[PDB]
Every structure is written in C-alpha cells, then in structure tokens.
Design a protein around this ligand. Structure first.
Ligand SMILES: CCCCCCSC[C@H](NC(=O)CC[C@H]([NH3+])C(=O)O)C(=O)NCC(=O)O
Ligand SMILES: CCCCCCSC[C@H](NC(=O)CC[C@H]([NH3+])C(=O)O)C(=O)NCC(=O)O
Ligand SMILES: CCCCCCSC[C@H](NC(=O)CC[C@H]([NH3+])C(=O)O)C(=O)NCC(=O)O
Ligand SMILES: CCCCCC/C=C/CCCCCCCC(=O)O
Ligand SMILES: CCCCCC/C=C/CCCCCCCC(=O)O
Ligand SMILES: CCCCCC/C=C/CCCCCCCC(=O)O
Ligand SMILES: CCCCCCCCCCCCCCCC(=O)O
Ligand SMILES: CCCCCCCCCCCCCCCC(=O)O
Ligand SMILES: CCCCCCCCCCCCCCCC(=O)O
Ligand SMILES: CCCCCCCCCCCCCCCC(=O)O
Ligand SMILES: CCCCCCCCCCCCCCCC(=O)O
Ligand SMILES: CCCCCCCCCCCCCCCC(=O)O
Ligand SMILES: CCCCCCCCCCCCCCCC(=O)O
Ligand SMILES: CCCCCCCCCCCCCCCC(=O)O
Ligand SMILES: CCCCCCCCCCCCCCCC(=O)O
Ligand code: NI
Ligand code: NI
Ligand code: NI
Ligand code: NI
Ligand code: NI
Ligand code: NI
Ligand code: NI
Lengths: 154, 154, 154
C-alpha cells in the first residue's frame, strides 16, 4: 500500500491467464489418463500412435503457452485489454479443439491448430501496434528536432 | 518516473520467481552432468534409465514452471502476496524433492510430485477466489439493477 | 483508469519480450520446414541428424524462454530497465545464433550457447542485486532495532 491498485487494468488478462492454466492442467490429466489406458509408464514417451498423439498434443500446447501469455499481456497493456482477452479466449478454445482433434487423429488437430495460430498472430499484431504507438512519436519528434538544426538561418 | 513504484506490492512474488529460475537452472546443470556420466551427447535424449529419469525430471519441471509462475502472480495480486509466496516456496521445495527422487527412482519422484500438485492447486484456488472477489459484486449489482426494472410500479 | 500508466516503466522489457516471441515463432516455422525437407510427419520427433538437431534446437530454446522472461522482468523492475533490455537483446541474438549453429552442426551450437548463458547469468545477477537492494536495508534495520534492546541501561 499504496492507495490505488492496477488490478482493474488487468483482471481480464488475469482471468484468461488462469483459464489457460486450468486448460493446461486438463491436458496433463489427459496425458496421465492415456498413460494408464495404453500402459505407458514414466519415463518413456513412446507407445501406440494414440498415446503418442495425446502426449504430443500436450507437449505442443505447453511449448506455445508462454508465447501466448507474453503476447496476451503485452497486447492487453499496450493495445487494449478487452480485445486481447477476446483473442486469448479464442486462442484457448482453438487449443482445446486442437488437443481433442489430435487425440483422435493427427489430421483432425489441423483445423483448430490454424484457428489458434490466427488468434495468436492477431495478438502479436496488437502487441506490435501498441508498442509502435508508444515509441514512434517520441522517436519521430527526436528526429525532427535534430533536423531543425538548420536554425540561425532559414 | 512516476513518483511511486509498485515494487513493494510484488517483491516476494519476484523473489520466489527468481528462486524458481535458479532451481530450473540447477536442474539444467544436473541434466548436463548426467549427459557426461552416462555418455549421452546432444541431440538424442534416450539412454540408460537413470539418465532418462534425470532428463525426464527436468522436462516435467520445465513444462510446469510457467503454470506455476502465472498462478503465483495472479494469486499474489488478486488474493494475497504473502500466502501466494508461501505456497510458491512449498511448491518449489516439493519440486526440488521431485527431481532428486526421480533421479534415484521413478517411484521416489511420487511423494514430492503430490506435494507439488497440492501447492499448485492451492495457488489456483487463491487465484480463482481473488478473481471471483474482483468480478462477482459488480456482476451481481448489474444483474440486480437490470431486475429493478420493475419500477414505475411497486 | 486510473490517471496514470506504468507502461513507460516497462516498454523496453515489453519490446524485448515481443521480440523473443517472434524469434520463438521463427524457430517453430523452421522446425515445420525441416519436417517437410526430411519428411518427418507428426507425431514422432526422430529422423535424420539434421532434423533432430533443428528440432532439438527449438526445444531447448523453448525450455529456456520462460526463464529468460521471468528474469528479464525482475531485473528490469528491480534493477534497471535499460540494462535488462540490453542483456535481453544480447541473449536473444545469442539464441538466434545458437539455433542456426545447431541446425548446421551440434558443435556450432556451442559458442552462441555460451554467449546466451552469460547474458542470462548477468540478468540473474541484476535480478538478485535488485532484490537484495529492496529487502536488505529493512532487514538490517529490523535486526539492529531488536538488538537495541539493550536500553533502560547503557
Ligand atoms: C502466429 C504465429 C505462430 C507461429 C506458428 C508457427 S508453425 C506451428 C507450430 N510449429 C511448431 O511448433 C514446430 C515445433 C513442434 N515442436 C513440432 O515438433 O512440430 C505448431 O503448431 N507445431 C505443432 C503442430 O504442428 O501441431
Ligand atoms: C494442481 C493441478 C495440477 C495438474 C496436475 C495434473 S497430473 C500431473 C502431471 N501430468 C503430466 O504432466 C502429463 C504430461 C507429462 N509430460 C508426462 O509425460 O507424463 C505430472 O506431474 N507429470 C509428470 C509426472 O507424472 O511426474
Ligand atoms: C545462467 C545460467 C543458465 C543455466 C545453464 C545450465 S547448462 C545449459 C543447458 N542445459 C540443459 O538445458 C539441460 C537440459 C536439456 N534439455 C538437454 O537435453 O540437454 C543447455 O544449454 N542445454 C542445451 C544445450 O546443451 O545446447
Ligand atoms: C512475462 C510476461 C509479461 C508480464 C508483464 C506484465 C506486467 C504489467 C505491469 C504494468 C501494469 C500497469 C497497468 C497497465 C497499464 C495500462 O493498462 O495501460
Ligand atoms: C505472465 C504471468 C503474469 C504476469 C502478470 C503480472 C502483472 C502485474 C501488474 C499489476 C501490478 C500492480 C500492483 C499489484 C496490486 C495489488 O497488489 O493489489
Ligand atoms: C511471470 C514473470 C513476471 C512478470 C511480472 C511483471 C509485473 C510488473 C508489476 C509492476 C510494475 C510497476 C512498474 C515498475 C516499477 C519500477 O520500474 O521501478
Ligand atoms: C471483451 C470481454 C473479454 C472477456 C474475457 C473473460 C474470460 C472468462 C474466463 C473466466
Ligand atoms: C529508446 C529506443 C528503443 C526503441 C524500440 C522500439 C520497439 C518497437 C517494437 C514494434
Ligand atoms: C509527445 C508529443 C507528440 C510528438 C509529435 C510527433 C509527430 C509524429 C507522430 C505522427
Ligand atoms: C510469508 C513470507 C513469504 C516469504 C517468501 C520469501 C522467498 C525467499 C527466497 C529468496
Ligand atoms: C466483464 C465480464 C467478464 C467476467 C469474467 C469473470 C472471470 C472469473 C474467473 C474465476
Ligand atoms: C461496488 C459496490 C458493491 C455492489 C454490491 C453487490 C452485492 C452482492 C455482493 C455480495
Ligand atoms: C538500452 C536500450 C535498450 C533497447 C531495447 C530495444 C529492443 C528493440 C526490439 C524492437
Ligand atoms: C519479508 C522477508 C522475506 C525476505 C526474502 C529476501 C529475498 C532475497 C533474494 C536475493
Ligand atoms: C528505510 C531506511 C533505511 C534503514 C537503514 C539500514 C542500514 C543498513 C543498510 C546499508
Ligand atoms: Ni499511492
Ligand atoms: Ni497510507
Ligand atoms: Ni500506480
Ligand atoms: Ni505519478
Ligand atoms: Ni516528476
Ligand atoms: Ni489514479
Ligand atoms: Ni477519473
């Protein structure tokens, strides 16, 4: 304390973040369940195709989850919190579908994969635009000022 | 600047975070050390059971580390910083024990694994409660207001 | 809102963060491209040495990316934003070189690997120093105060 909080500026990003964590946890329990169904004991991550697909779905989601988080927060802070949260929700939903698809067949992972990549790319673009909005004016001003300069003439 | 900082509201979360990083680094050096002991050269992540166990312990910890971070921060901001840090400390300790256990035997990874999952689940519950506390009143109010509405009667 | 923002205190950390995301994405597209070149279809992460090297380069980078993020932010907030961003830039550049090297040969991954580890270690040290600066005075004061205590004597 501090007589103000910035919780209000980030609660939706936080809610989507927690939702993402819960979804990852879900994936983990699904991998353990495939480990019982197809009798694959730790360590060792090879087995029947269906296990390898479930396993691999969880691994890919894990690898993308920090990318999602980073961009979600940057976009939400630099561009717009609500838009970022929406894209995040779409992303996470796409990822749930990716995992389910993959579990059934490699080919069925593909449509939700593409959906998830577009949402992520949108998040990136918002992050980039937000950062650009932050930095570009001061930079342009500094460049104009140096040019100015001229002076003691004109 | 800014004539105030919010460092004070997050320093314990930050300290636990750094501690978590250091522990992950430690795991990494342990995997490289198992790579020398059992002669496994990159790439390739298969070898004797003990190497595969050490390797796999490091991989699982890596996969859970972002989940831990996300929830630690949400819990610490939305619920209570100290509680979140404590759960985080317990989690990380549980994880150190998980890795050591696993290195010795798959079965010995199990007790600290369960300890780590409970701490994580507690962190999730705090995150959830904190978010609920943030959103639920305004929502309930908005719902009551819409009902009210009635009016120009009663 | 809130009539101030802390975007200004973190924009460089955010820019480096986004840059890191873009680099990871790049690595991902490189793995998919190696999957087409050497005909390796999902799931299954074994194949010719060059594929396994590209794959493995992407995996290692993925595993270190959250460590990098955590420390980058802690260092940037607790120590100095600009220094942290610089180290981050060096780190990410080192990582680009690590991935390219690895893709060509296991041995060529080694020099940029070491460069990346030093930048990361520097980030850790800054995080640690920043945290120490935050906590150590109050602690020392509290300890001196308890000693003081004496009193009603001296
Ligand atoms: C908005 C920009 C986002 C970047 C997308 C880049 S390509 C997609 C991405 N490719 C990878 O992750 C490559 C590595 C992955 N670990 C693998 O073994 O295939 C993927 O979905 N891999 C898993 C899959 O193919 O299902
Ligand atoms: C509080 C909620 C947290 C969610 C816990 C879900 S189950 C535990 C978790 N399961 C997984 O990670 C599955 C995937 C893992 N990569 C594997 O190959 O087994 C685990 O500890 N795997 C490694 C292990 O079994 O040691
Ligand atoms: C500043 C402190 C940072 C900590 C560095 C610790 S050692 C380096 C690190 N070792 C590991 O990641 C071990 C696990 C890795 N997954 C593997 O299979 O080799 C690495 O670069 N592995 C990949 C590689 O050797 O290229
Ligand atoms: C590791 C991933 C990145 C996490 C970074 C999140 C940091 C947030 C700090 C700034 C919060 C201040 C309020 C936001 C300002 C605004 O909404 O315009
Ligand atoms: C990617 C993981 C999530 C990281 C998010 C952390 C963002 C912090 C921004 C808000 C900080 C403001 C002070 C906290 C307010 C409080 O303690 O009540
Ligand atoms: C999960 C990785 C860690 C993310 C944490 C980032 C949280 C930032 C909250 C505090 C921001 C307030 C401004 C910084 C104060 C300063 O620069 O001295
Ligand atoms: C624009 C609104 C964004 C809504 C995100 C809410 C996330 C709900 C998950 C609990
Ligand atoms: C102070 C100069 C640093 C400028 C970095 C701009 C980042 C743009 C990212 C899109
Ligand atoms: C801060 C003040 C704004 C500076 C003006 C820069 C002009 C170029 C931007 C379009
Ligand atoms: C309640 C207190 C929480 C303490 C967390 C401190 C972490 C120490 C790691 C350096
Ligand atoms: C503005 C409406 C969004 C509400 C999302 C609530 C999240 C609850 C998470 C537990
Ligand atoms: C902000 C003011 C609080 C609104 C009252 C909502 C009542 C239900 C909550 C228990
Ligand atoms: C000290 C300056 C740090 C500069 C970081 C800028 C990152 C550029 C990436 C867009
Ligand atoms: C309140 C006491 C907690 C102190 C934790 C200090 C962390 C130092 C990390 C270097
Ligand atoms: C807050 C005020 C500073 C307390 C003084 C502590 C003395 C030891 C630090 C060197
Ligand atoms: Ni104040
Ligand atoms: Ni006060
Ligand atoms: Ni403030
Ligand atoms: Ni101010
Ligand atoms: Ni001033
Ligand atoms: Ni204000
Ligand atoms: Ni106002």
């Amino acid at each position: 304390h501090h007589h103000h909080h910035h919780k209000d500026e980030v609660a939706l990003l936080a809610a989507v973040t927690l939702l993402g964590v819960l979804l990852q946890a879900y994936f983990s329990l699904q991998v353990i369940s495939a480990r019982r169904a197809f009798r694959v004991s730790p360590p060792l991550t090879t087995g029947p195709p269906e296990f390898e697909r479930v396993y691999r779905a969880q691994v890919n989601c894990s690898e993308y989850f920090p990318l999602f988080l980073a961009t979600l927060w940057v976009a939400g802070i630099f561009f717009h919190e609500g838009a970022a949260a929406l894209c995040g929700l779409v992303y996470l939903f796409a990822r749930l579908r990716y995992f389910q698809g993959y579990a059934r067949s490699a080919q069925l992972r593909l449509a939700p994969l593409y959906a998830s990549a577009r949402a992520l790319a949108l998040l990136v673009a918002l992050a980039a635009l937000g950062l650009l909005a932050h930095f570009l004016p001061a930079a342009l001003r500094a460049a104009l000022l140096g040019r100015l300069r001229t002076l003691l003439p004109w």
